Design a binder for this molecule. Structure first.
Ligand SMILES: Nc1ncnc2c1ncn2[C@@H]1O[C@H](COP(=O)(O)OP(=O)(O)OP(=O)(O)O)[C@@H](O)[C@H]1O
Ligand SMILES: Nc1ncnc2c1ncn2[C@@H]1O[C@H](COP(=O)(O)OP(=O)(O)OP(=O)(O)O)[C@@H](O)[C@H]1O
Ligand SMILES: Nc1ncnc2c1ncn2[C@@H]1O[C@H](COP(=O)(O)OP(=O)(O)O)[C@@H](O)[C@H]1O
Lengths: 533, 209
């Protein structure tokens, strides 16, 4: 059945060094031992396995490599969603056509037939727990029955192997995972350092063989820089780097006098890697640098001590979350008066944290959604956050997320309960998390018994003295010395209570008049606005 | 043999360690069948899905000659919120019907509860179903606090002596999990300023019963 034309090195899989050893020991330890002993023991072969993990980490590759290694026939790749049909009896026919060749060859060549391999993709899109209550049957009760009957029925097949692949392993039936049916489970996770080195070596072997690499390309660096890259986004990086190198070469010669031999020598690639890494690849489980422009519009500018106090508190919380081991889950709430700029400080803490995973959950992308969809979105974000050795998630404008309105009061309970349950669920073993929240109405949250779930509170104050306002104006740099002195004389009284956002709006508005009438309008607007709580 | 079904409720204040004690009582019983029905595996479910999940767990429990089922965080299952009040009637009725349904002949069961709000559960006429209740208290003395500090093994001798003087002359109403949180949050300062921060946090947290 097996021939010596297979070696592990030639396969080309890097990072799965246990997910293969254990599989080989368990599933395929009876397909290689001499037939005499196996027959004497009288043991049946395993009839399939299940692979789960994030998307794009090398599961299909492993299935095809197993198929080639076992000297099987051509696998019948299938797609889960493309089996269903709207007529009465068409889905079951599609599920039944796959098991035809094995049945035909089992009754003709006796017990000396080949090995047929069947591959399912997204196996959980068809098989879901079957209802129990009378009249509570689902719409896909018939597909599951057909699949169960075919895999292990009254007529025995001993020349088949079934591989299933899925991402959500908690929705599959429970009679489809017992010893005899799919009975071996393995997990394919994100690669680690020594798993991101092997992939790069495998992918640059070709360039090294054909003598295209430069003399300064260091692979330890490239292994270190990419932190949460999945296996499918390193080949993209390599190819993008080579493509930009070629583009540079071509456009150079046309507007350069390099020379043909000079161009060939220039074909080497050293910094294209760095440039492409910077501005070509966007990971799916990594920090995003494109959002901090949307939430930090005018940057953080100091106008007092409270800014420093808040930032230091955030730093201490980050340190605690990183180092301690008795408490792997931490939380904190930022609350203050409206227009005080809380989201900006939350984003600043998150971005200065230096964590591999950073994400922001906000209602800006949830216009028109029904509560159930909002629950699904929140759960998806947290599920993606549970797949890293460090992380941090920010929840914005909790009151807007609950659909609150003072009349009534009226709000939604499903979202509140989901949120109150997701603040106390610890991650898998050995991983850490950090959750930040922002709100303006703390008392309403206090009534909802949602304020003691968080582990700490931080106050974001408001401008409260004239000198602070003058210093903020100086930092902004709009009004000249004489105008500043006039304002200082006018507003020397320390009775100012204004938000840093309303102040920017006021300054922008007041600059729409002639130079003569500038200070008067600004002072009139400031006086008209509230002067105390 | 007269009573093939029993129930019990563990209740106390928040942050006191009810789930841990329920799990430890369940683990040391050597029952062939043990299971836990928690609400963190039911995020986003509607009423009927929760009913079906509970019913399935009990149906499975009814097929062993001995059993033990744990139902924790009862108030999160009912979706309770003081404003209103609001909650789910269907789940409440399902639970109240399942609490007093004997298994087939010859088989035995045991149900353990958990909750931090006993009065609310009493308003709905639910403490009538449970056979009896147990009380889990907090730390309510300086001596017990010192014993807990010694057993956790964090602060050294001299710092222990410093803590002793400022604590024995008052009372304390801190839970046990919150104590771990405070100890962890204090150790992030420089060697000199650890005891001061711990005392400040403890004084802030402490409140009358
Ligand atoms: N020291 C500062 N702190 C916060 N924001 C600042 C500071 N200096 C400048 N800003 C700018 O102020 C704006 C902060 O607005 P932001 O959206 O954070 O307000 P908010 O308090 O969250 O709003 P809302 O009233 O809608 O809740 C951003 O443009 C930020 O760049
Ligand atoms: N003697 C003890 N009793 C209970 N828990 C203890 C004890 N010693 C240490 N612990 C630990 O304290 C923590 C108690 O947290 P736990 O989840 O049990 O609290 P809880 O009562 O369920 O809280 P909540 O009020 O939030 O529902 C667990 O880590 C438990 O291991
Ligand atoms: N362990 C690995 N070693 C080498 N390449 C990998 C590995 N995992 C994933 N890849 C890359 O991923 C690509 C295909 O992945 P794919 O089969 O789509 O993953 P999945 O089946 O999980 O969607 C290939 O081009 C391959 O280079």
């Amino acid at each position: 059945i097996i021939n010596p034309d297979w070696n592990f090195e030639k396969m080309g899989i890097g990072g799965l060094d246990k997910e293969f050893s254990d599989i080989f020991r368990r599933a395929f330890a009876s397909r290689v031992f001499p037939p005499e002993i196996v027959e004497q023991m009288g043991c049946k072969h395993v009839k399939g396995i299940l692979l789960y993990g994030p998307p794009g980490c090398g599961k299909t590759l492993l299935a095809r490599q197993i198929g080639k290694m076992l000297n099987a026939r051509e696998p019948k790749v299938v797609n889960g969603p493309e089996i269903l049909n709207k007529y009465v009896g068409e889905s079951e026919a599609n599920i039944r056509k796959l098991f035809a060749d094995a049945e035909e060859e089992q009754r003709r060549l006796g017990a000396n037939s080949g090995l047929h391999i069947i591959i399912f993709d997204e196996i959980d899109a068809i098989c879901k727990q079957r209802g129990s209550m009378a009249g509570s049957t689902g719409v896909h009760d018939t597909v599951v029955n057909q699949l169960l009957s075919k895999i292990d029925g009254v007529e025995q097949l001993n020349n088949i192997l079934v591989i299933g692949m899925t991402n959500r392993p908690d929705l599959i039936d429970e009679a489809l995972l017992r010893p005899g049916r799919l009975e071996v489970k393995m997990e394919i996770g994100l690669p680690d350092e020594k798993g991101r080195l092997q992939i790069l070596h495998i992918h640059t072997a070709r360039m090294r063989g054909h003598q295209l690499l430069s003399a300064d390309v260091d692979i330890k660096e490239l292994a270190v820089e990419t932190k949460n890259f999945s296996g499918a986004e390193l080949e993209g990086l390599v190819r993008a780097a080579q493509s930009t190198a070629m583009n540079r070469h071509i456009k150079a010669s046309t507007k350069v006098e390099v020379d043909m031999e000079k161009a060939e020598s220039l074909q080497v690639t050293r910094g294209d890697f760095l440039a492409s890494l910077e501005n070509d690849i966007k990971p799916a489980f990594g920090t995003n640098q494109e959002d901090y422009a949307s939430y930090i519009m005018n940057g953080i500018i100091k106008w007092g001590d409270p800014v420093t106090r808040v930032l230091d508190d955030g730093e201490l919380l980050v340190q605690q979350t990183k180092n301690s081991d008795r408490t792997p889950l931490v939380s904190v709430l930022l609350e203050g008066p409206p227009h005080s700029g809380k989201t900006a400080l939350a984003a600043k803490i998150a971005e200065e944290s230096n964590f591999p995973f950073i994400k922001i959950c906000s209602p800006d992308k949830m216009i028109g959604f029904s509560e159930t969809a909002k629950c699904q979105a929140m759960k998806k974000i947290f599920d993606d956050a549970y797949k890293s050795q460090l992380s941090c998630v920010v929840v914005d404008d909790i009151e807007r997320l609950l659909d609150y309105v003072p009349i009534g009061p009226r709000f939604s309970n499903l979202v509140l309960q989901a949120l109150l349950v997701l603040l106390k669920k610890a991650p898998p073993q050995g991983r850490k998390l950090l959750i930040i929240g922002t709100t303006s109405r703390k008392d309403v949250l206090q009534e909802m018994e949602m304020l003691n779930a968080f582990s700490t509170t931080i106050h974001v104050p408001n401008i409260a003295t004239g000198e602070q306002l003058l210093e903020a104006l100086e930092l902004l740099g709009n009004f000249k010395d004489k105008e500043r002195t006039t304002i200082a004389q006018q507003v020397k009284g320390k009775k100012v209570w204004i938000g840093i956002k309303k102040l920017l709006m006021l300054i922008e508005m007041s600059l729409q008049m002639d130079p003569e009438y500038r200070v008067r309008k600004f002072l009139a607007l400031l006086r008209e606005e509230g002067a105390s709580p």
